[PDB]
mmCIF file of N, CA and C in Angstrom:
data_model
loop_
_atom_site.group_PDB
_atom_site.id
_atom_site.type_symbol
_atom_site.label_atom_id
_atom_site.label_comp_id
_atom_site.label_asym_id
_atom_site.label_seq_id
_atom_site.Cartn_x
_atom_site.Cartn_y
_atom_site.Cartn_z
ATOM 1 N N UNK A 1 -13.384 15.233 6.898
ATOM 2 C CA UNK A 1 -11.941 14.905 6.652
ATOM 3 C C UNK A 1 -11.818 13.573 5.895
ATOM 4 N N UNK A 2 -10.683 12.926 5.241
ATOM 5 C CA UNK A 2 -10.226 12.281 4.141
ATOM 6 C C UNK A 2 -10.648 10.581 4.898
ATOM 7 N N UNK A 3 -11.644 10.282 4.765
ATOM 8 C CA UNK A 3 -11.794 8.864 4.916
ATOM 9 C C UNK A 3 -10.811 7.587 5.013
ATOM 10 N N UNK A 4 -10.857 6.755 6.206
ATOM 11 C CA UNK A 4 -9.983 5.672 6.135
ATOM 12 C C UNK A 4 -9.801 5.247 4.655
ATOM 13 N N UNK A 5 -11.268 4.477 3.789
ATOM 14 C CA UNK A 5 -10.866 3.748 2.776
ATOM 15 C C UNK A 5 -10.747 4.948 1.509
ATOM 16 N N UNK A 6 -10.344 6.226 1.316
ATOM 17 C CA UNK A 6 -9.691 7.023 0.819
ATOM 18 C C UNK A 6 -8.182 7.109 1.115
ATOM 19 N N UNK A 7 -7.831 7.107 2.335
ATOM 20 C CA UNK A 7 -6.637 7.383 2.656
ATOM 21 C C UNK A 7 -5.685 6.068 1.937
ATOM 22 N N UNK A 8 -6.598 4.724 2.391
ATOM 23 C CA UNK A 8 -5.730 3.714 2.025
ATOM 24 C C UNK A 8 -6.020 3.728 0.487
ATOM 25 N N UNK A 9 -6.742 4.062 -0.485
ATOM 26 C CA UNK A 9 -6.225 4.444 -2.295
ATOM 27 C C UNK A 9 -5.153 5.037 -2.321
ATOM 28 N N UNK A 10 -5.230 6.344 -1.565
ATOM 29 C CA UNK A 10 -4.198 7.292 -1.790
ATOM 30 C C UNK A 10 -2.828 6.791 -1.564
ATOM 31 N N UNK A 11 -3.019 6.357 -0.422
ATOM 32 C CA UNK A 11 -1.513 5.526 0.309
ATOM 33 C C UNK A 11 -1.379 3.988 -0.407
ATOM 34 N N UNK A 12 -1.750 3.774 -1.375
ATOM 35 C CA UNK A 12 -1.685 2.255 -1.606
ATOM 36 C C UNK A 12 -2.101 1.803 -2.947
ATOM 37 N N UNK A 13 -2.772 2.233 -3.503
ATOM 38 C CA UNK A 13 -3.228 1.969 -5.164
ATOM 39 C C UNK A 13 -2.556 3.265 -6.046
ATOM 40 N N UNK A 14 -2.398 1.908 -7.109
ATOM 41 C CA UNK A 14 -1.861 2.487 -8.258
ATOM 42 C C UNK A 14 -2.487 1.618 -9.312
ATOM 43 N N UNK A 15 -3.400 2.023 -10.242
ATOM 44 C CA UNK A 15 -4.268 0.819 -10.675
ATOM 45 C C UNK A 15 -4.066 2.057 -11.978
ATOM 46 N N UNK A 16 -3.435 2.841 -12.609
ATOM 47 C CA UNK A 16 -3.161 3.096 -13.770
ATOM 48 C C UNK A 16 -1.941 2.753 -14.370
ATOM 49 N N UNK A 17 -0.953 1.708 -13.655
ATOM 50 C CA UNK A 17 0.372 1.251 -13.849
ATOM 51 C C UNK A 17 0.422 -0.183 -13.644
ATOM 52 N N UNK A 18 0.975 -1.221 -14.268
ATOM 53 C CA UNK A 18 1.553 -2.399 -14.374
ATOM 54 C C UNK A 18 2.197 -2.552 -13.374
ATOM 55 N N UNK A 19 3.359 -2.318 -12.882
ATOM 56 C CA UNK A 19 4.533 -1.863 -12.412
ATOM 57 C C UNK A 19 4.960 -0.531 -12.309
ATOM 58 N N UNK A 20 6.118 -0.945 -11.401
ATOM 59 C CA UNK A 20 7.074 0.171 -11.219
ATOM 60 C C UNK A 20 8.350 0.244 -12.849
ATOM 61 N N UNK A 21 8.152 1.525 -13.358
ATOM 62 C CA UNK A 21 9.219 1.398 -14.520
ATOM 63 C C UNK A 21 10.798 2.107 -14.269
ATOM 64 N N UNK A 22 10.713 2.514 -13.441
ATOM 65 C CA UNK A 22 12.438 3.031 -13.448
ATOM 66 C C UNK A 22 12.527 2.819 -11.390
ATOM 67 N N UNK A 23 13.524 2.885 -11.212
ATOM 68 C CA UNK A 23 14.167 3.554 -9.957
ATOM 69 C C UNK A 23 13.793 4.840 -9.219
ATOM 70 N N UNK A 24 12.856 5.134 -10.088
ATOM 71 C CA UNK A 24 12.911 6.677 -9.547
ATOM 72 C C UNK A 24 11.226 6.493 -9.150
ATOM 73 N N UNK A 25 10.249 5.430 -9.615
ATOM 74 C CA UNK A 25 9.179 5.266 -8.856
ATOM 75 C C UNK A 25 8.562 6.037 -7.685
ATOM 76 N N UNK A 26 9.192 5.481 -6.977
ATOM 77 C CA UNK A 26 8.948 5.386 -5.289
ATOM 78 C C UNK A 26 9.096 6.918 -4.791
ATOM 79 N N UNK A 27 10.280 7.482 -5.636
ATOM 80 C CA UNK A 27 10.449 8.892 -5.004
ATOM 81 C C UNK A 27 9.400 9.737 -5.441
ATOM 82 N N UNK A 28 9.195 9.433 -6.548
ATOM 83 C CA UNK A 28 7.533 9.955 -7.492
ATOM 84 C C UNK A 28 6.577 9.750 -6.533
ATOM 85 N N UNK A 29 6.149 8.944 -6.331
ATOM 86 C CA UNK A 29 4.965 8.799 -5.849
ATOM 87 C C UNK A 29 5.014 9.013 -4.525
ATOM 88 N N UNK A 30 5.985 8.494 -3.456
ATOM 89 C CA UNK A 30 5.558 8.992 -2.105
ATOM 90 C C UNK A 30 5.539 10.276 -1.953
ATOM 91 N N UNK A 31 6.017 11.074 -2.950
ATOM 92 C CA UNK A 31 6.094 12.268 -2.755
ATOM 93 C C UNK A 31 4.422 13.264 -3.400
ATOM 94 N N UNK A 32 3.861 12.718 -5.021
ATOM 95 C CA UNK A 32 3.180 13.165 -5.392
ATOM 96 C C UNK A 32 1.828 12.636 -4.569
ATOM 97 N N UNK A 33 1.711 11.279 -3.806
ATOM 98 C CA UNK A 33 0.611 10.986 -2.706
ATOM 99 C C UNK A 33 0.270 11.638 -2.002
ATOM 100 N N UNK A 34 1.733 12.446 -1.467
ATOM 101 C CA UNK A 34 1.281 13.509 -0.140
ATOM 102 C C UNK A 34 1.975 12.188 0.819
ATOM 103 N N UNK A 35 2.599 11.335 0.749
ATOM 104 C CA UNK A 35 3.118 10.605 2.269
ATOM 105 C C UNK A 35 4.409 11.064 2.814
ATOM 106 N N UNK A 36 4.926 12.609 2.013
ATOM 107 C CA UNK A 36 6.213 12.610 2.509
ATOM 108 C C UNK A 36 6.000 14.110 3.060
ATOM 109 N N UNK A 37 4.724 14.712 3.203
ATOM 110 C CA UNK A 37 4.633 16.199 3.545
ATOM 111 C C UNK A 37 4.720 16.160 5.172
ATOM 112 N N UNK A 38 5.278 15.404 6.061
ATOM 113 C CA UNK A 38 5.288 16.165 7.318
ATOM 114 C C UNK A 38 6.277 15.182 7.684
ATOM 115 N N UNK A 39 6.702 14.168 7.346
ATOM 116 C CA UNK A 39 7.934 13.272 7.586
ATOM 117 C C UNK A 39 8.479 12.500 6.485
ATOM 118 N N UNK A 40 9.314 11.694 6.602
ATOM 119 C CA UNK A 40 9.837 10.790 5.303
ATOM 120 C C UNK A 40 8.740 9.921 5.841
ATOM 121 N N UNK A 41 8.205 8.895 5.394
ATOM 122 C CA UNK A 41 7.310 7.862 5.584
ATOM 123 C C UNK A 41 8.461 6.795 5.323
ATOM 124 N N UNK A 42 8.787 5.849 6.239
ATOM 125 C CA UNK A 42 9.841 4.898 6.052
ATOM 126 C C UNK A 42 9.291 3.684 5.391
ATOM 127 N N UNK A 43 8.553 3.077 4.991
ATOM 128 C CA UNK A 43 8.124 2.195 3.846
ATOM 129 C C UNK A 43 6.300 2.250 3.439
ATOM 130 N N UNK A 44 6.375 1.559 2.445
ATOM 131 C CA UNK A 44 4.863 1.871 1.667
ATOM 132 C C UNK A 44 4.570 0.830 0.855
ATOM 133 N N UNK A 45 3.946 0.332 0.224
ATOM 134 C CA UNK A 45 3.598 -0.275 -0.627
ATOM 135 C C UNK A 45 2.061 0.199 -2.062
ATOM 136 N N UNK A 46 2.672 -0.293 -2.898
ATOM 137 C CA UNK A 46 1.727 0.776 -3.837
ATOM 138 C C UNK A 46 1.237 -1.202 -4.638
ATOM 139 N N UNK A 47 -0.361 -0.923 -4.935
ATOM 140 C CA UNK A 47 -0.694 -1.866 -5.340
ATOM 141 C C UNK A 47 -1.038 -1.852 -7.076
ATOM 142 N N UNK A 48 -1.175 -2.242 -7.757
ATOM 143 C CA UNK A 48 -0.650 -2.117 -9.322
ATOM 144 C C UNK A 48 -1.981 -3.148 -9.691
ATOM 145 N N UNK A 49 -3.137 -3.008 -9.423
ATOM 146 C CA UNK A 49 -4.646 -3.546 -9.776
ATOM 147 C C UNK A 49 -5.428 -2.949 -9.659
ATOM 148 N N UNK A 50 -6.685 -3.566 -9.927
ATOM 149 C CA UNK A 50 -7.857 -2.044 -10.252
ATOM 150 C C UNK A 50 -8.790 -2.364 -8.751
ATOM 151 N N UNK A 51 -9.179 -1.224 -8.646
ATOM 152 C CA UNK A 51 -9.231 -1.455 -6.975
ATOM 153 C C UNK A 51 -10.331 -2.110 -6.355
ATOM 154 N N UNK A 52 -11.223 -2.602 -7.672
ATOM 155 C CA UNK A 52 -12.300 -3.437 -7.422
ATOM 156 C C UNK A 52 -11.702 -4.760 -6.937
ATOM 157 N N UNK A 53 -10.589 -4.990 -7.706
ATOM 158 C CA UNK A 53 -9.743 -6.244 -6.940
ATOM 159 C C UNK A 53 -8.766 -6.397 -5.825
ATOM 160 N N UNK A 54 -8.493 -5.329 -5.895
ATOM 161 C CA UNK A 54 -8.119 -4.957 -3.892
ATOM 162 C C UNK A 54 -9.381 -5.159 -3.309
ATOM 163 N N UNK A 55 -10.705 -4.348 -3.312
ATOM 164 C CA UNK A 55 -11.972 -3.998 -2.313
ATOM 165 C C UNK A 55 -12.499 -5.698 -2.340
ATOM 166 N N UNK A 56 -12.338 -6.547 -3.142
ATOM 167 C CA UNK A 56 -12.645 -8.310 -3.427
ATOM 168 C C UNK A 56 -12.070 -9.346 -2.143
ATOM 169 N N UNK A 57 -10.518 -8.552 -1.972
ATOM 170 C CA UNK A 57 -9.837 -8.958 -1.144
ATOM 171 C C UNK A 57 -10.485 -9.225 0.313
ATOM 172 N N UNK A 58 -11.606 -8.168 0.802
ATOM 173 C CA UNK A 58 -12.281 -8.371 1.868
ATOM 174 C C UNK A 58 -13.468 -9.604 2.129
ATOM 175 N N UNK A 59 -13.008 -10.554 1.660
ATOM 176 C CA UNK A 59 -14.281 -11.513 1.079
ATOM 177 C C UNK A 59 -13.301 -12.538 0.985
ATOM 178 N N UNK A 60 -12.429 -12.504 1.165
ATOM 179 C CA UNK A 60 -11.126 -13.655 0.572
ATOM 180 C C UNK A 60 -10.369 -14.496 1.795
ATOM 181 N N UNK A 61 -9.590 -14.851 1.945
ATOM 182 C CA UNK A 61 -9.194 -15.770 2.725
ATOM 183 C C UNK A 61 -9.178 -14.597 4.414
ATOM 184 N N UNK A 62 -9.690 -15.208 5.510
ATOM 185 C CA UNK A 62 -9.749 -14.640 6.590
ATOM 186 C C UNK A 62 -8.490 -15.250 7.570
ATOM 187 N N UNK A 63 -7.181 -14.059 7.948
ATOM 188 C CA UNK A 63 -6.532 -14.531 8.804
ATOM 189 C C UNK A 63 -5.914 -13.045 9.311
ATOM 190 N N UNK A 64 -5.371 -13.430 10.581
ATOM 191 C CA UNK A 64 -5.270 -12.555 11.824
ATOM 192 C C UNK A 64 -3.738 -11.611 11.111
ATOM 193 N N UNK A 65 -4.350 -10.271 11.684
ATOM 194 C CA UNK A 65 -3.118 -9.013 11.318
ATOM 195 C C UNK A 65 -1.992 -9.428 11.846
ATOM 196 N N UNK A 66 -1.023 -8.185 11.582
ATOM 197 C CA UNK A 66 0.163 -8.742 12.577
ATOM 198 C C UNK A 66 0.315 -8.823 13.681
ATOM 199 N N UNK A 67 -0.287 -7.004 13.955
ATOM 200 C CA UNK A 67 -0.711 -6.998 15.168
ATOM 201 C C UNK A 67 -1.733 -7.988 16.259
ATOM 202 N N UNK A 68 -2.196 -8.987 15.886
ATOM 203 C CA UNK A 68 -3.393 -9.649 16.322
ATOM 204 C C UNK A 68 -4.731 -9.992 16.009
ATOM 205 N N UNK A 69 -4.948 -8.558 15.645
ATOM 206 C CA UNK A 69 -6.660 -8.329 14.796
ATOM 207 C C UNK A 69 -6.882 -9.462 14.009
ATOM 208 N N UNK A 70 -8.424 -9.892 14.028
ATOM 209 C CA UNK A 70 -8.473 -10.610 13.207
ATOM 210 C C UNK A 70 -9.875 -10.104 12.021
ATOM 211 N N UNK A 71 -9.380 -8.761 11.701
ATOM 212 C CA UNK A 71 -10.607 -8.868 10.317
ATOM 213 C C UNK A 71 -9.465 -8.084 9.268
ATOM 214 N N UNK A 72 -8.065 -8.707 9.322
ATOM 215 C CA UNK A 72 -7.561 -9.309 8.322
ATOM 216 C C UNK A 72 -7.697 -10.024 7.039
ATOM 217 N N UNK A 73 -7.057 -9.461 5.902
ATOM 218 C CA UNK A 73 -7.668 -10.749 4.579
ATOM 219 C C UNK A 73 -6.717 -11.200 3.718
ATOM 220 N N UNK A 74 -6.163 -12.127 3.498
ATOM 221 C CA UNK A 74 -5.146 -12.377 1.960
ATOM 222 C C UNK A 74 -5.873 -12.595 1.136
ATOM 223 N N UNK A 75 -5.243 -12.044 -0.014
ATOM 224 C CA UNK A 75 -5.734 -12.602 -1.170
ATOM 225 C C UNK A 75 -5.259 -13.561 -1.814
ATOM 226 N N UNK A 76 -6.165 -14.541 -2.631
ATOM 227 C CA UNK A 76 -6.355 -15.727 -3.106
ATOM 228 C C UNK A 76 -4.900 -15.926 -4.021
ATOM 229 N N UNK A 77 -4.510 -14.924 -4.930
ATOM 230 C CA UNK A 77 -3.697 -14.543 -5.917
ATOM 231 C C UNK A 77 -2.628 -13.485 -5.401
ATOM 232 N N UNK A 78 -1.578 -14.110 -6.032
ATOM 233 C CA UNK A 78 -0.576 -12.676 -6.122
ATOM 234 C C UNK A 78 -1.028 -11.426 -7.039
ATOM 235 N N UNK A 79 -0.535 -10.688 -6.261
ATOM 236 C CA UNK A 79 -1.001 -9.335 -7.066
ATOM 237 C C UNK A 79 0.655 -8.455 -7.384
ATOM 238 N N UNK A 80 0.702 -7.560 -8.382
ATOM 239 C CA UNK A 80 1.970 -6.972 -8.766
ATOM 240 C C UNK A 80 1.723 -6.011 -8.038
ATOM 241 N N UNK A 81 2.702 -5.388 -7.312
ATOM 242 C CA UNK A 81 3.503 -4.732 -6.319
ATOM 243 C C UNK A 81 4.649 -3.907 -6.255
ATOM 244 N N UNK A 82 4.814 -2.723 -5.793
ATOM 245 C CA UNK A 82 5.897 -1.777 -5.951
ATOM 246 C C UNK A 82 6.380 -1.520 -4.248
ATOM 247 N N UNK A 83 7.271 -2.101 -3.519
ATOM 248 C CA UNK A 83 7.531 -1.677 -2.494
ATOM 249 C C UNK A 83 8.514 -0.781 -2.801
ATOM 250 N N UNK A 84 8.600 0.453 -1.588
ATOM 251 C CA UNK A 84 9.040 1.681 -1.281
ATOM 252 C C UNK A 84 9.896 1.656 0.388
ATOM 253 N N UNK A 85 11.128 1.945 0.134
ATOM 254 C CA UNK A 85 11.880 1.764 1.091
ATOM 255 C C UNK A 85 12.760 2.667 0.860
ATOM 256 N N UNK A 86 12.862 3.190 2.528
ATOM 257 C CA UNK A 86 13.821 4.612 2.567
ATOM 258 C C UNK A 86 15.542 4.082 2.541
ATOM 259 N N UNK A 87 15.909 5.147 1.684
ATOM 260 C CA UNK A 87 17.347 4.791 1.424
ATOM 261 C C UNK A 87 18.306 5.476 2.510
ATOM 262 N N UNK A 88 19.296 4.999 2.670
ATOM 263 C CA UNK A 88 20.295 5.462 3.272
ATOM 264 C C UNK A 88 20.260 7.374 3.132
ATOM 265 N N UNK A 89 20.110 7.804 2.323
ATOM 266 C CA UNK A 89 20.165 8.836 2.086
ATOM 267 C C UNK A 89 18.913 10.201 2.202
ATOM 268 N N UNK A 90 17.944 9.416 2.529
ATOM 269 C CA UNK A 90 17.204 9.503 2.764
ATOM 270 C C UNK A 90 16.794 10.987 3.639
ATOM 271 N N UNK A 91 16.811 12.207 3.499
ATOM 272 C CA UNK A 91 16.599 13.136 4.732
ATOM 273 C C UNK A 91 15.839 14.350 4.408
ATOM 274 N N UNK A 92 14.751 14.542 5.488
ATOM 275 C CA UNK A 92 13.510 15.434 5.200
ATOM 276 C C UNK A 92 14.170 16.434 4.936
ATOM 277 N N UNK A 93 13.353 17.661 4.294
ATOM 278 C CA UNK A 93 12.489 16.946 3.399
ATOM 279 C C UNK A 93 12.713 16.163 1.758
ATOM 280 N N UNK A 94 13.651 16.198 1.685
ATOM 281 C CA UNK A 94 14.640 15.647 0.526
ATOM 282 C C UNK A 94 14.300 13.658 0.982
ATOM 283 N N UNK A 95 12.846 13.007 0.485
ATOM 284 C CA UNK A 95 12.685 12.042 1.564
ATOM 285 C C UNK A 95 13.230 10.827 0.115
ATOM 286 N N UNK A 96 14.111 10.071 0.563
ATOM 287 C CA UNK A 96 14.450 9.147 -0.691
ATOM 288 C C UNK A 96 14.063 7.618 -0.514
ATOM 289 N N UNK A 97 13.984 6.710 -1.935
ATOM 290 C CA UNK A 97 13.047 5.636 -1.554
ATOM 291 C C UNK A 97 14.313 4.747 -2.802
ATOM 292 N N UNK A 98 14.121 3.307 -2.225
ATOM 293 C CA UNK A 98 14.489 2.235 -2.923
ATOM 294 C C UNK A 98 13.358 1.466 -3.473
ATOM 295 N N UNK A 99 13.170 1.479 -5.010
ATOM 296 C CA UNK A 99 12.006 1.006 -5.496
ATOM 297 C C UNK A 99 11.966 -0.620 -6.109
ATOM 298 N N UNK A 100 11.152 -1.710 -5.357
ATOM 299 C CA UNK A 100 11.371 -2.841 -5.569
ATOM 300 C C UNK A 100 9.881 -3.761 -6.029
ATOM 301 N N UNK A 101 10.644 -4.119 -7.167
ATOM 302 C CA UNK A 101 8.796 -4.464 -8.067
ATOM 303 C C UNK A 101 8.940 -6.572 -7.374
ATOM 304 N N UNK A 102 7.538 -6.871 -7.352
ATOM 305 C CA UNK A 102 7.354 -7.522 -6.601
ATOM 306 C C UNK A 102 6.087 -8.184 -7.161
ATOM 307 N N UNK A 103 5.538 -9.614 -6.570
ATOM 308 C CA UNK A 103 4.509 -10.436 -7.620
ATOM 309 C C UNK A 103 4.033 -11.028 -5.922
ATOM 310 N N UNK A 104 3.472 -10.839 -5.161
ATOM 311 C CA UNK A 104 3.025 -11.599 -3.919
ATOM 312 C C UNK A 104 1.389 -11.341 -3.431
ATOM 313 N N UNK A 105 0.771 -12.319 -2.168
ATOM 314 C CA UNK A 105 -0.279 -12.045 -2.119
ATOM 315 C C UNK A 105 -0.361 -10.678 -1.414
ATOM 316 N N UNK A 106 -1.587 -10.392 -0.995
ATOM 317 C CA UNK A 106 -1.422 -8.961 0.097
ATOM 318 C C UNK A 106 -2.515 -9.047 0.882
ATOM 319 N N UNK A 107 -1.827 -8.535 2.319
ATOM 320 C CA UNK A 107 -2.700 -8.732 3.417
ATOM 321 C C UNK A 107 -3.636 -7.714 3.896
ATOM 322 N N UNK A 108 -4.556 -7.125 4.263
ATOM 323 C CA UNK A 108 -5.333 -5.941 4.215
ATOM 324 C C UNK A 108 -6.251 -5.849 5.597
ATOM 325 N N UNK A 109 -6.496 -4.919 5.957
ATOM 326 C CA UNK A 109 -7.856 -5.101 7.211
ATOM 327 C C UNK A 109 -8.590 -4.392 6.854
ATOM 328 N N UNK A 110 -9.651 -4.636 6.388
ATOM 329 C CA UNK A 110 -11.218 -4.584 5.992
ATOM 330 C C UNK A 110 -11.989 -3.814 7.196
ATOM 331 N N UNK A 111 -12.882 -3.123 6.996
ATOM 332 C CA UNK A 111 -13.873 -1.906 7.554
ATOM 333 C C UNK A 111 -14.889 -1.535 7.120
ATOM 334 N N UNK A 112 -16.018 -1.496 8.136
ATOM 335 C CA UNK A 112 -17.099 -0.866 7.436
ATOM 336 C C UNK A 112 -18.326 -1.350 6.619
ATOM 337 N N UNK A 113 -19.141 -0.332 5.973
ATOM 338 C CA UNK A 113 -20.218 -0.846 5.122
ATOM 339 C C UNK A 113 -20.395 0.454 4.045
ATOM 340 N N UNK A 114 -20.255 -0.184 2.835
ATOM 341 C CA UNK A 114 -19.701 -1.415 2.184
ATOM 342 C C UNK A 114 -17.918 -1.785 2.904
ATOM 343 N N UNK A 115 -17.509 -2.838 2.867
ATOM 344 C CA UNK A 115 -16.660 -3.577 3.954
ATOM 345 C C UNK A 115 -15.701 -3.483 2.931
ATOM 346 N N UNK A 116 -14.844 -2.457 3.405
ATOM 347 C CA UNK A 116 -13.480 -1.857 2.308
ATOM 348 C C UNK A 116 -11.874 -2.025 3.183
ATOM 349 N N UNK A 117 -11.340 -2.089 2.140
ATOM 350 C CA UNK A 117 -10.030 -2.336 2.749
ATOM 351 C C UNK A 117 -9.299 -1.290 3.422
ATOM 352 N N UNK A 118 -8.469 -0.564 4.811
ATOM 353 C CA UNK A 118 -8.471 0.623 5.221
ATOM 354 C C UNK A 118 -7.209 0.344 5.813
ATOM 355 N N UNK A 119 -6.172 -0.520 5.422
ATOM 356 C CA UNK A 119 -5.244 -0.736 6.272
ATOM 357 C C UNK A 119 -4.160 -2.178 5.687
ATOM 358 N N UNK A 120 -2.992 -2.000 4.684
ATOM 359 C CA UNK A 120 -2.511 -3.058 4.295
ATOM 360 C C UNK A 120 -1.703 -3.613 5.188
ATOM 361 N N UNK A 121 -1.644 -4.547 5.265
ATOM 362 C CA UNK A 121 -0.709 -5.354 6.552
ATOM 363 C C UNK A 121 0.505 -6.066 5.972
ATOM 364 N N UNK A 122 0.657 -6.793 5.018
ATOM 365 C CA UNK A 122 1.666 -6.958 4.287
ATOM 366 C C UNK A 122 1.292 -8.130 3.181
ATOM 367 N N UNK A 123 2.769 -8.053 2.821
ATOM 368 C CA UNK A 123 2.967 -8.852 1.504
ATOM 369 C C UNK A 123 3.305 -10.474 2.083
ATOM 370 N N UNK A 124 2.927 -11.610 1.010
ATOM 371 C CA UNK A 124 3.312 -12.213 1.284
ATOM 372 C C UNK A 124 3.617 -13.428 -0.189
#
């Protein structure tokens, strides 16, 4: 079955795009990812770098998740960013998203060998 640090590409990189270019982003993609096939997924974040520089991130500044965990990582640099947020209107399976382009660091929890990122924690 579909690997943690697969799942988090799928759910989280976008490293053939700059940015988000229209409004209609978010509904694109949570939908063509597969994050909207068994519920609306109420927020997401899509990362807009090549994923050698996300997987770098695990090597980078060490600080504790939200939840507590601490094999947490920020990165050094802001990275460009597309957050995905469910709209008012929002209703399965018709799942709708507010698309908001964004320049911040990003927080990640790291896994494994080779020690990959499997879990974004947030923006900052």
């Amino acid at each position: 079955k579909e690997t943690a640090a697969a799942k988090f590409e799928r759910q989280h990189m976008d490293s053939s795009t700059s940015a988000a270019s229209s409004s209609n982003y978010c509904n694109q993609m949570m939908k063509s990812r597969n994050l909207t096939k068994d519920r609306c997924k109420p927020v997401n974040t899509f990362v807009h770098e090549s994923l050698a520089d996300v997987q770098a991130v695990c090597s980078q500044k060490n600080v504790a998740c939200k939840n507590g965990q601490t094999n947490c990582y920020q990165s050094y640099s802001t990275m460009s960013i597309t957050d995905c947020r469910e709209t008012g209107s929002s209703k399965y399976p018709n799942c709708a998203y507010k698309t908001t382009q964004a320049n911040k660091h990003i927080i990640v929890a790291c896994e494994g060998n080779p020690y990959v990122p499997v879990h974004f924690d947030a923006s900052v």
